[PDB]
Amino acid sequence: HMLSDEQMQIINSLVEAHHKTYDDSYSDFVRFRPPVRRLSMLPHLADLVSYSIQKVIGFAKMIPGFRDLTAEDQIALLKSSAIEIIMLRSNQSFSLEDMSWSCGGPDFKYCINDVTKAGHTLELLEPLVKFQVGLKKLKLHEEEHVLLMAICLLSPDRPGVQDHVRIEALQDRLCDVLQAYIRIQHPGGRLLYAKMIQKLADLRSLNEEHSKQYRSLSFQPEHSMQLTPLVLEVFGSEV
Amino acid sequence: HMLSDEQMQIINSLVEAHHKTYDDSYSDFVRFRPPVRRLSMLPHLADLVSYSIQKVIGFAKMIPGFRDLTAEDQIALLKSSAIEIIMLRSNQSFSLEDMSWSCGGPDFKYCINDVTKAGHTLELLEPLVKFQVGLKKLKLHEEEHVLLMAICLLSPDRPGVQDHVRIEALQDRLCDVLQAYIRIQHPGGRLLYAKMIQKLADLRSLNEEHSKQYRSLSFQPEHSMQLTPLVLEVFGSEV
Amino acid sequence: RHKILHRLLQ
Amino acid sequence: RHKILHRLLQ
Numbered sequence: 307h308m309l310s311d312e313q314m315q316i317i318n319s320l321v322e323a324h325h326k327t328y329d330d331s332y333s334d335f336v337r338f339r340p341p342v343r344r345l346s347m348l349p350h351l352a353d354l355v356s357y358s359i360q361k362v363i364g365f366a367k368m369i370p371g372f373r374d375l376t377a378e379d380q381i382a383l384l385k386s387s388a389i390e391i392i393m394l395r396s397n398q399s400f401s402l403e404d405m406s407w408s409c410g411g412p413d414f415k416y417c418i419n420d421v422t423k424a425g426h427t428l429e430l431l432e433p434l435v436k437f438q439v440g441l442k443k444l445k446l447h448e449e450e451h452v453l454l455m456a457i458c459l460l461s462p463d464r465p466g467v468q469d470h471v472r473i474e475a476l477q478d479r480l481c482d483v484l485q486a487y488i489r490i491q492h493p494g495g496r497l498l499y500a501k502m503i504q505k506l507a508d509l510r511s512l513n514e515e516h517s518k519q520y521r522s523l524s525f526q527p528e529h530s531m532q533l534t535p536l537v538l539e540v541f542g543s544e545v
Numbered sequence: 546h547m548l549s550d551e552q553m554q555i556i557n558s559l560v561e562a563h564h565k566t567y568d569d570s571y572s573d574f575v576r577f578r579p580p581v582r583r584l585s586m587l588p589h590l591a592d593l594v595s596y597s598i599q600k601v602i603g604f605a606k607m608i609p610g611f612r613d614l615t616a617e618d619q620i621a622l623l624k625s626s627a628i629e630i631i632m633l634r635s636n637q638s639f640s641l642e643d644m645s646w647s648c649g650g651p652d653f654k655y656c657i658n659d660v661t662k663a664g665h666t667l668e669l670l671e672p673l674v675k676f677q678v679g680l681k682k683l684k685l686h687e688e689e690h691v692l693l694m695a696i697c698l699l700s701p702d703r704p705g706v707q708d709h710v711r712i713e714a715l716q717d718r719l720c721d722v723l724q725a726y727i728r729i730q731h732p733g734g735r736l737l738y739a740k741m742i743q744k745l746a747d748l749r750s751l752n753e754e755h756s757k758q759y760r761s762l763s764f765q766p767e768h769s770m771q772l773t774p775l776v777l778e779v780f781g782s783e784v
Numbered sequence: 785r786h787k788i789l790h791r792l793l794q
Numbered sequence: 795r796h797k798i799l800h801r802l803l804q
């Protein structure tokens with residue numbers, strides 16, 4: 307058995323969308339407020355996350371069907387999944403060798419301790435790193451990684467979504483494309499689809515914790531003033 | 546004739562307030578988004594101006610009597626005079642030799658062309674530089690420069706001020722301190738006080754132009770997203 | 785409001 | 795609102 311031309315088109319469009327929104331040279335990192343290793347890493351991490359939100363918007367806009375949704379559903383999907391898409395996409399810079407995210411030089415090498423310097427606790431950081439390890443160990447094909455981000459983004463079970471039927475139909479088409487890809491293109495991937503669905507569940511707990519910790523930081527005007535307008539709009543509750 | 550101990554105290558407090566809020570090493574400049582020489586200088590200039598607003602708040606809080614005003618009057622004074630205080634204080638880095646603002650290396654050397662790269666036009670830039678030249682040529686004593694910033698900040702003729710009587714009384718005390726200082730401490734300064742009052746008038750036209758140009762930039766969400774929360778709050782009209 | 789989001793979504 | 799200003803003015 308094989309995939310249809312429609313399924314092939316979806317994969318090509320998603321891989322193309324990712325290549326357009328993910329820069330392997332990390333050359334834009336020099337434009338952020340520099341990393342400083344109280345809450346010394348906050349300016350750099352805020353600019354890194356703000357930059358990554360723009361990329362996620364860019365990728366989302368190229369997901370087939372996403373642009374056809376109302377502006378409000380697109381916002382609802384983006385607002386609640388952006389941190390999850392960032393966590394998923396960050397896996398491409400994550401290394402099992404040093405348990406850190408390496409984006410070129412040691413300048414842009416992020417460890418747990420650095421994230422602690424933006425105000426985060428081990429309550430988020432330890433499960434984040436365990437998630438990164440587990441996902442890296444899945445050794446996902448670029449096609450799978452890209453399908454997983456798009457599946458995550460198109461979850462109809464998010465607060466504020468209106469056209470739940472349309473979104474769930476878009477996500478299902480993507481899950482079928484994923485199941486068929488693993489089966490046809492991934493040897494030894496018999497248990498893979500299920501493992502990927504579990505990673506999406508893990509992401510909900512990470513999102514939950516991140517939201518709590520962001521709420522705590524953002525409440526203090528001395529730290530909130532260090533954020534960017536886009537971060538305030540996306541992670542903010544003013545929906 | 547001489548100054549009273551009260552007048553001496555006011556000058557010492559103002560000079561001390563300025564030394565505490567103005568860093569001659571410009572060492573904090575490396576923490577801003579770097580200068581890029583469309584609208585390439587916007588991130589750096591936004592961070593420079595955001596940093597300078599914090600300094601102006603800091604200086605204002607140490608102006609005798611300012612802290613006794615209501616929070617609302619302090620906001621009204623700060624919101625409409627901050628750009629003028631920035632223009633006045635910038636004169637300390639302005640050089641007649643190169644007609645630019647030199648803050649250490651060529652990294653932090655700002656010319657008219659660089660400000661053009663944050664979206665400004667010659668309508669603001671040419672009168673700004675002419676103001677900088679004229680003010681530098683006044684060869685103000687540190688005591689005079691500091692008195693001029695405090696006089697500017699305590700102008701009761703600003704939109705949104707409530708306790709106009711109190712503010713005008715604070716500013717008058719400062720103008721008397723200034724007039725007496727020039728007379729007693731500045732040789733050849735017979736025409737100086739009047740020249741300084743004219744510079745405050747010049748600042749109103751610069752403020753007027755800056756407000757127009759800021760309104761134009763801030764209306765576009767692609768540039769407004771590059772601003773900092775403090776800049777949006779201070780230069781914004783949401784009073 | 786979502787001024788930035790709307791604009792980025794074009 | 796002036797959340798940042800108020801806080802900076804202490």
Ligand SMILES: [C][C]([C][C][C][C+2]1234B567B89%10B%11%12%13B85%14B%1158B%12%11%15B%139%12B%1061B%12%112[C+]5%153B%14874)[C]1[C][C][C]2/C(=[C]/[C]=C3/[C][C]([O])[C][C]([O])C3=[C])[C][C][C][C@]12[C]
Pocket residue numbers: 348351352354355358392393395396397398399400407409416421424425426430520523533537
């Ligand atoms: C908890 C963190 C989230 C902080 C949100 C925050 B921090 B603070 B404040 B600051 B502002 B507010 B608070 B927290 B909340 C918002 B920022 C993590 C999440 C993914 C991590 C990461 C990703 C690396 C990359 C590199 C590369 O693969 C591209 C990819 O897209 C990507 C982002 C390394 C560092 C730490 C992270 C950003």
Ligand SMILES: [C][C]([C][C][C][C+2]1234B567B89%10B%11%12%13B85%14B%1158B%12%11%15B%139%12B%1061B%12%112[C+]5%153B%14874)[C]1[C][C][C]2/C(=[C]/[C]=C3/[C][C]([O])[C][C]([O])C3=[C])[C][C][C][C@]12[C]
Pocket residue numbers: 587590591593594597631632634635636637638639646648655660663664665669759762772776
């Ligand atoms: C028109 C400009 C105002 C832009 C406001 C803007 B630009 B754009 B956007 B960007 B964001 B929004 B728009 B415009 B409006 C806000 B920024 C000028 C005003 C003073 C200039 C200056 C000062 C130098 C110093 C150095 C040193 O003496 C310390 C002193 O305090 C100081 C600031 C050199 C560069 C250009 C300036 C900042």
